[PDB]
Ligand binder design. Structure first.
Ligand SMILES: [Zn+2]
Lengths: 1109, 15, 195, 115, 53, 95
DNA sequence: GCTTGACAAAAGTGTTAAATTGTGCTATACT
């Protein structure tokens, strides 16, 4: 497999014919196509393409050439070339730059009148590039562009039933995606109407005549369907010219009707590439659907003369009932109704196409003024620069990378989160569906997800169903259709002829399961095989009817879902919860790979990029906590920087540590360093803890969890959290506010940790309310009150012109300062307008597990930590081992996630080695185990691949073959249960309980970030109500339902006091505070601002609203 | 999932 | 149908003269305030820009009548004044509403207290209150049915003023400010008073 | 001129991408009346009213009139000279003596938090 | 959160009625026959003409 | 307060409007451009709607609690708690 | 306990000087 590959025996019985492809290929291949890299060219030409064109070249060719209105000048662009990136990734991230490369294009100007030629290279600007991890470094932040899901333009056929007087009507709408509309629909009057540009129903014969058809040809060719005969009978147009004139009159009656303009408008409407285009994917879709112009390549971006007639003929065939059709000049194709949820119609807009669209818009905006500058300047004095402004294109590309919904912050919580984020399929954004629309119609699992979109893993938030993840075995078709691999089957024998097919290509075949038993040679051993039909239905067919076969059992699950052991035993809802929870695991101080897992732990770690892999074979020159040096066989040195204690976007600590030593031979692709949540190159999101399944004094009641104090003492569930505090100093109308150690009206003890320039020293410890960096602002008018005047006269402290505005540690936060960054205009830093200085301080803290912190496994079992008992209190095994965690029994069977019990049993089996009595012959249960899995030592790691894992019988048999402990006795019997002594009373529990090892992980939902409180604080400017939305001093919302509850209680006084005194009652609020502080009884509430304001407003409308007794 | 118009049209007479 | 409308004025405390207005009131400035944001930026209530539009028209009319302008100009000015008053009371009831900068109408007086926002609404949606907090829960089996466990910091924040009063009463702090500083720093003496 | 040319932004915008909040639901008044300070002021006066009582009638009067705790006008020495026809210098001496008495910890420690 | 302010500086004076100053009331008549009153201070001279409500 | 029994509504004959107002808005100007003080006889005028800041007139001749209830002979604004700008209304007399 | 004379920086005098603001007027013909 891979060079390192820590030994992890697998329970798989099937053979993998195809290795898992590059998980981050979707984000890289699209961009390689966009910039037309050499390797992309080689791959495209080797596929069977001639003269392939990249995205940038395609856009330039579409725009070029451009000719002026006079027709005497022409401008063209060609040969886009890229330069070396300005700086490296690390430098750009440190200095908040943008990782980009200069872009150059060869522009050529031709003077038609004379013949002058001007060729030169124009600087297009800095094109944002991407790293090897499929991320963009924008202003020092790692952003990710998620592939969008859109409806491919083309011709679609639908049929509905009229709900007024029964019967059915069929329609066809042509979606170009860049032009106008053109559809044909059938009414209940035995006719065929065409509604051009969605304006008004017109006869189809009118359109036919307009194109240049006559009655004789229509009656000679369209002699199959009677409805069209009736339409022609109803038609009043005689000649072709009248049809054009009639269409022009019906379209725009206002303008004068003339034959020439009538033809020109229709010619302009759809038969021009400058007004109507199919985006070079609609043409392919129409060719595949209608079947015209098959074989030969097509470059036209309009509707062919035969396309319209073929579409109309297909519509009438569909109404007629014909299941087959063919036209001269094409290939016979079937007849059926299309649906919008099917992926033969839904394409994928990857990062390359998303960038291409914005580049196209920018180039159009530039050309708008390019032609104007041509028409406003003098001739024989014009060079390419003098008529090319690069401002608009750069502005457009910059705006797309900082405002577009598709491009957003990369989830840096852990490697798996980032990996899943990169390969995400969103169904919203520019040109997509709204978040408040498409209910239970587009978010349902269509039978076409199988092999192209994971049907179980999806966000549970507002975006349920709209957002999904690509499957393990899937790669986007150059056109943009997700295709999946399948094994060719001929004459009932499976062969090694893997073929990638799309959804529509798959609807014409019969595919079988991957686990279907097969003979040694390859023939099918059974007769009836389970397969999938063309309708997305499962059926048993003959062995000869099998056409294809799945590559592997886990062809439908995603990367996140494939990390869940025993996924076939968990319910769909629980599997979804676990898959979405696995992306919220905070990296721990010391990671450890799971005892029981799948085969996806390794790959997911390497593809995520959170590890360092040797580029070429060599010997480790030296190893340090900061970098690794390796000498290759060719004598070329390589040095890898190890980013140490680096803050992730979400606040988790991201750091790497070497796992190699000097003199170690390393092969290409071997992991030499591991990331935050990786051990020996395998993902280690959580920890293996000893778990006993039993209720305990009600402390684990309602999904609560009891933990041992050992986890706290040994830092089993401890994490590092880093936060950044930023503050700026700028020029103001009263002067420029400066950062200074000196602060007015404050003691010298509070600022004992400040440095010479007024910033907290690195390594200092800070709690809430501590000064991080001094800052003062000009105040202005003082006008001291006599009380203050006398008070400061007795003290003698004269007035100070400045007011303290130093940065303070937010309430509830504490830690140590680990880094300080300073930017200033004095040193030519690129600060925003008016800002003189900027200071960032990083505070890192060592957060241990504590009560209320969420904690969950991989099977959707979640819970807060209700109590942390001391070591002696926890139940302990007879050998004296105290269990680390206790999970309530009542919550397992109901949630229908029995897979966690299997994980527990197999984890116990893995922790203590096993030895099957194979000396006398393989037992019946062990006859299926691979030869390598008959015996393993203690602390072994095993793999149970999803849908091809350990069977229940094999696990039950293994449970009865576990090795003894140091004393020489077995703790867990054949049933998976063990006796536990009570830690408080000492009496053994009356019945044995399930005990094992479970892999559980700490979620980011910590208590420290979810605690709020208010007594008195900031108030809104307009409503005068307490403001919220922030954890410092945010107020709670008292909705109308709570008011109903209070009214039901009859709690009149509480409701009044809560609606007025504690909200928008300025007069009485201060009185209430004064009464509370003075010990006086609270006064009666007044009248809320919400009523006085209402009264004044309603009076302002000339309404004489008055009160009376 | 549901807007005001659909929720309003949900409880119409429909008869 | 006309009977109800006609009778509403008969035997009632108003007269039909109320339809036509000789003067229009002006809402107090603080209800349409101009807030000076930090940095020189000014944020104004768009309502402020509607009243002004009326005055500009009205004053102009007061000049046109002075010099004896022709009937067409005076009628046009009166029409402008009527449209301006209508926009002030209802933006979009008659014709198309004034848009101002951007592509959105200015919300006038009746646009308030009429839509999803504005009184007679947004009062039955929920307002924010002081002396309140939020926190995750855990199962407490040792509690009595009438008891509940409240985290120390949350309790201190909620009961701050009472704690300050008690501290001042016990001579731990000399005055209100000293007790406030002691609580915010969370000195050891605070917990004894809080309990 | 650049800063003058700016146009005020409407207070009724749609900050937040929609109509949940318009613009002003998330603006705090920096000039807000904060209770803890206000109440403290009502105490400070009282404290002073008590502290100045510890001084003699004449010594207390000059400080009250000099700082105008009653009327608010910072009466000059000449004005205070009309209490008994006293010259400015004696009133200044009395004021300095009272200042020395007050700023001592025995009295200043009581008030050394309202700074 | 955003921060704003006005030019209306706040004062913490608690003297709703602590101090009382002398005043005199002048009375004015408008051209249309409406009469109004204004409590001027007892300072210098009463203005001859006043802009009324 | 806290003595209400019913609330009634009705039309305004413009006599109620002229009674409510503390002064008419003669001009459209709101505030000065370089200085940020209200413009007199216009919107936000202190003479009509009251002082902007606590217990101070426009020119500052009379200020603070000692002068409470006094109209400055040069401004026309009456020294007040400055929270009255939420309570006082004006009117525009249509030609 | 309280006052006179010698000095001093600070708060005003009175007018002038510079900046700011309101205002009427531009006559090839143009609808
Ligand atoms: Zn004044």
């Amino acid at each position: 497999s891979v060079p390192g590959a820590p030994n992890r025996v697998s329970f798989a019985k099937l053979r993998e014919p195809l290795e898992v492809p590059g998980l981050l290929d979707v984000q890289t291949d699209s961009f390689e196509w966009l910039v037309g890299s050499d390797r992309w060219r080689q791959a495209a030409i080797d596929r069977g393409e001639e003269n392939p064109v990249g995205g940038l070249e395609e856009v330039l060719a579409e725009l070029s050439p451009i000719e002026d209105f006079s027709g005497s000048m022409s401008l063209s662009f060609s040969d886009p070339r890229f330069d070396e990136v300005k700086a490296s990734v690390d430098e750009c991230k440190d200095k908040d730059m943008t990782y980009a490369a200069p872009l150059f294009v060869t522009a050529e100007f031709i003077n038609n009148n004379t013949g002058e030629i001007k060729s030169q290279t124009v600087f297009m600007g800095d094109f944002p590039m991407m790293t090897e991890k499929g991320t963009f470094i924008i202003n020092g932040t790692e952003r990710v562009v998620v592939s969008q899901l859109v409806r491919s333009p083309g011709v679609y056929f639908d049929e509905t039933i009229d709900k007024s007087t029964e019967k059915t009507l069929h329609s066809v709408k042509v979606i170009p995606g860049r032009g106008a509309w053109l559809e044909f629909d059938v009414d209940k009057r035995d006719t065929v109407g065409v509604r051009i540009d969605r304006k008004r129903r017109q006869p189809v014969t009118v359109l036919l005549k307009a194109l240049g058809w006559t009655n004789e040809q229509i009656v000679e060719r369209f002699g199959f369907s009677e409805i069209m005969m009736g339409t022609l009978e109803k038609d009043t147009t005689s000649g072709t010219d009248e049809a054009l004139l009639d269409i022009y009159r019906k379209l725009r009656p206002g303008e004068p009707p003339t034959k020439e303009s009538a033809q020109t408008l229709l010619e302009n409407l759809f038969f021009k590439e400058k007004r109507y285009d199919l985006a070079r994917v609609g043409r392919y879709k129409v060719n595949k659907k209608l079947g015209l112009n098959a074989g030969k390549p097509i470059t036209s971006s309009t509707l062919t003369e035969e396309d319209v007639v073929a579409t109309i003929e297909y519509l009438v065939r569909l109404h007629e009932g014909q299941t087959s059709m063919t036209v001269p000049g094409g290939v016979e194709v079937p007849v059926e109704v299309d649906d919008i949820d099917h992926f033969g119609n839904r394409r994928l807009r990857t990062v390359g196409e998303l960038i291409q669209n914005q580049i196209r818009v920018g180039l159009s905006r530039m050309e708008r003024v390019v032609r104007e500058r041509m028409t406003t300047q003098d001739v024989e004095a014009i060079t390419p620069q003098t008529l090319i402004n690069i401002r608009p294109v750069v502005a457009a590309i910059k705006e797309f990378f900082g405002t577009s919904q598709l491009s957003q912050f990369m989830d840096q919580n852990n490697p798996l989160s980032g990996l899943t984020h990169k390969r995400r399929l969103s169904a919203l954004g520019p040109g997509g569906l709204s978040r408040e629309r498409a209910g239970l119609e587009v978010r349902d699992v269509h039978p076409s997800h199988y092999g192209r979109m994971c049907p179980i893993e999806t966000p549970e938030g507002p975006n349920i169903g709209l957002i999904g993840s690509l499957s393990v075995y899937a790669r986007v078709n150059p056109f943009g259709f997700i295709e999946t691999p399948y094994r060719k089957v001929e004459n009932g024998v499976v062969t090694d002829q893997i073929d990638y097919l799309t959804a529509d290509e798959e609807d014409r075949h019969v595919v079988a399961q991957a686990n279907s038993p097969t003979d040694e040679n390859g023939r099918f051993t059974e007769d009836r095989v389970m397969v999938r039909k063309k309708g997305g239905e499962v059926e048993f067919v003959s062995a000869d009817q099998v056409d294809y076969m799945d590559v592997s059992p886990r062809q439908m699950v995603s990367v996140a879902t494939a990390m869940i052991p025993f996924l076939e035993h968990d319910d769909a809802n629980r599997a979804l919860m676990g898959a979405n929870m696995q992306r919220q695991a905070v990296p721990l101080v010391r990671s450890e790979a799971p005892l029981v897992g799948t085969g996806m732990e390794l790959r997911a770690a390497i593809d995520a990029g959170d590890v360092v892999v040797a580029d070429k074979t060599g010997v480790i020159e030296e190893v340090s906590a900061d970098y690794i040096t390796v000498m290759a066989d060719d004598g070329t040195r390589q040095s890898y920087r190890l980013r140490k204690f680096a803050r992730s976007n979400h606040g988790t600590c991201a750091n790497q540590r070497p796992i190699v030593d000097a003199g170690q031979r390393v092969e290409a692709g071997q992991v030499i360093a591991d990331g935050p949540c990786t051990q020996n190159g395998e993902m280690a999101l959580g920890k293996n803890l000893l778990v006993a399944i039993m209720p305990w004094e009600g402390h684990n009641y309602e999904d609560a969890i009891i933990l041992s104090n050992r986890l706290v003492e040994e830092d089993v569930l401890t994490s590092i959290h880093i936060e950044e505090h930023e503050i700026d100093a700028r020029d103001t109308k009263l002067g420029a506010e400066e950062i200074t150690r000196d602060i007015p009206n404050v003691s010298d003890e509070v600022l004992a940790d400040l440095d010479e320039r007024g910033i907290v020293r690195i390594g200092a410890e800070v709690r809430d309310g501590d000064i991080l960096v001094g800052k003062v602002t000009p105040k202005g008018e003082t006008e001291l009150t006599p009380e203050e005047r006398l008070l400061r006269a007795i003290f003698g402290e004269k007035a100070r012109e400045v007011r303290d505005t130093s940065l303070k540690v937010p309430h509830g936060e504490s830690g140590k300062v680990i880094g300080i960054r300073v930017f200033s205009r004095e040193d030519d830093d690129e600060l925003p307008a008016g800002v003189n200085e900027l200071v960032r301080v990083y505070v890192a803290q060592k957060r241990k597990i504590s009560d209320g912190d969420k904690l969950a496994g991989r099977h959707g079992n979640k819970g807060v930590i209700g109590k942390i008992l001391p070591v002696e209190d926890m139940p302990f095994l007879p050998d004296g081992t105290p269990v680390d965690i206790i999970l309530n029994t009542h919550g397992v069977p109901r949630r229908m996630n029995i897979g966690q019990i299997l994980e527990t049993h197999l984890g116990w089996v893995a922790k203590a080695g096993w030895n099957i009595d194979v000396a006398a012959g393989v037992p019946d249960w062990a006859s299926k185990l691979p030869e390598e899995l008959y015996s393993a030592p203690a602390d072994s790691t095993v793999a149970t691949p999803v849908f091809d894992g350990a069977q229940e019988g094999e696990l039950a048999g293994l449970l009865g073959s576990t090795l003894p402990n140091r004393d020489g006795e077995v703790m867990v019997d054949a049933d998976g249960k063990s006796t536990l002594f009570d830690g408080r009373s000492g009496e053994p529990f009356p019945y044995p309980v399930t005990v094992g090892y479970m892999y559980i992980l700490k979620l980011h939902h910590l208590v420290d970030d979810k605690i709020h409180a208010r007594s008195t604080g900031p108030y809104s400017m307009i409503t005068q109500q307490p403001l919220g939305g922030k954890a410092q001093f945010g107020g709670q919302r008292f909705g109308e339902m709570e008011c109903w509850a209070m009214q039901a209680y009859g709690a009149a006084y509480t409701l009044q006091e809560l609606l007025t005194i504690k909200s928008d009652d300025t007069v009485g609020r201060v009185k209430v505070y004064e009464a509370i502080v003075k010990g006086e009884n609270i006064p009666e509430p007044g009248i809320p601002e919400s009523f006085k304001v209402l009264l004044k407003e309603l009076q302002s409308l000339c309404l004489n609203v008055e009160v009376l007794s | 999932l549901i807007d005001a118009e659909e929720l309003a049209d949900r409880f119409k007479e429909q008869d | 149908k006309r009977l109800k409308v006609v009778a509403a004025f008969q035997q009632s405390g108003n007269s039909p003269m109320g339809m036509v207005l000789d003067a229009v009131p002006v809402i107090p400035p603080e209800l349409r305030p101009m807030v000076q944001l930090d940095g020189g930026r000014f944020a104004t209530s768009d309502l402020n820009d509607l009243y002004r539009r009326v005055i500009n028209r009205n004053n102009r009319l007061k000049r046109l009548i002075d010099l004896g302008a022709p009937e067409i100009i005076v009628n046009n000015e009166k029409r402008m004044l009527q449209e301006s008053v209508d926009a002030l009371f209802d933006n979009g009831r008659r014709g198309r509403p004034v848009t101002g900068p951007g592509n959105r109408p200015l919300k006038s007086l009746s646009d308030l207290l009429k839509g999803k926002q504005g009184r007679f609404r947004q009062n039955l949606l929920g307002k924010r209150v002081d002396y309140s907090g939020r926190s995750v829960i855990v199962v407490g089996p040792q509690l009595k049915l009438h008891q509940c466990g409240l985290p120390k910091l949350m309790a201190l924040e909620l009961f701050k003023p009472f704690v300050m009063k008690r501290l001042v009463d016990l001579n731990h702090a000399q005055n209100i400010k000293s007790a406030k500083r002691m609580v915010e720093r969370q000195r050891p003496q605070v917990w004894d008073v809080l309990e | 001129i650049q800063q003058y040319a700016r146009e005020p932004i409407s207070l009724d915008q749609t900050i937040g991408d929609e109509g949940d909040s318009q613009l002003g639901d998330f603006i705090e008044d920096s000039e807000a009346v904060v209770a803890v300070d206000a109440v403290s002021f009502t105490l400070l006066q009282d404290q002073l009213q008590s502290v100045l009582e510890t001084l003699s009638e004449r010594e207390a009067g000059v400080v009250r009139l000099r700082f105008g705790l009653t009327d608010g006008q910072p009466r000059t020495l000449d004005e205070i000279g009309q209490v008994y026809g006293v010259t400015r210098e004696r009133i200044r001496q009395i004021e300095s003596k009272t200042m020395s008495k007050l700023r001592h910890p025995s009295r200043s420690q009581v008030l050394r938090d309202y700074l | 959160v955003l921060r704003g302010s006005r030019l209306g500086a706040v004062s913490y004076e608690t003297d709703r009625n602590h101090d009382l100053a002398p005043r005199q009331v002048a009375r004015y008549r408008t051209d249309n026959g409406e009469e109004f009153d204004v409590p001027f201070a007892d300072d210098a001279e009463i203005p001859g003409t006043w802009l009324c409500r | 307060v806290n003595f209400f029994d019913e609330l009634r509504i009705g039309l305004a004959t413009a006599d109620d409007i002229r009674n409510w107002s503390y002064g008419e808005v003669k001009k459209p100007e709101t505030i000065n451009y370089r200085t940020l003080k209200p413009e007199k006889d216009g919107l936000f005028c202190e003479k009509i709607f009251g002082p902007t800041r606590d217990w101070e007139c426009y020119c500052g001749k009379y200020k603070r609690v000692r002068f409470k209830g006094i109209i400055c002979e040069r401004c026309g604004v009456e020294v007040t708690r400055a929270k009255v700008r939420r309570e006082r209304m004006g009117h525009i007399e249509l030609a």
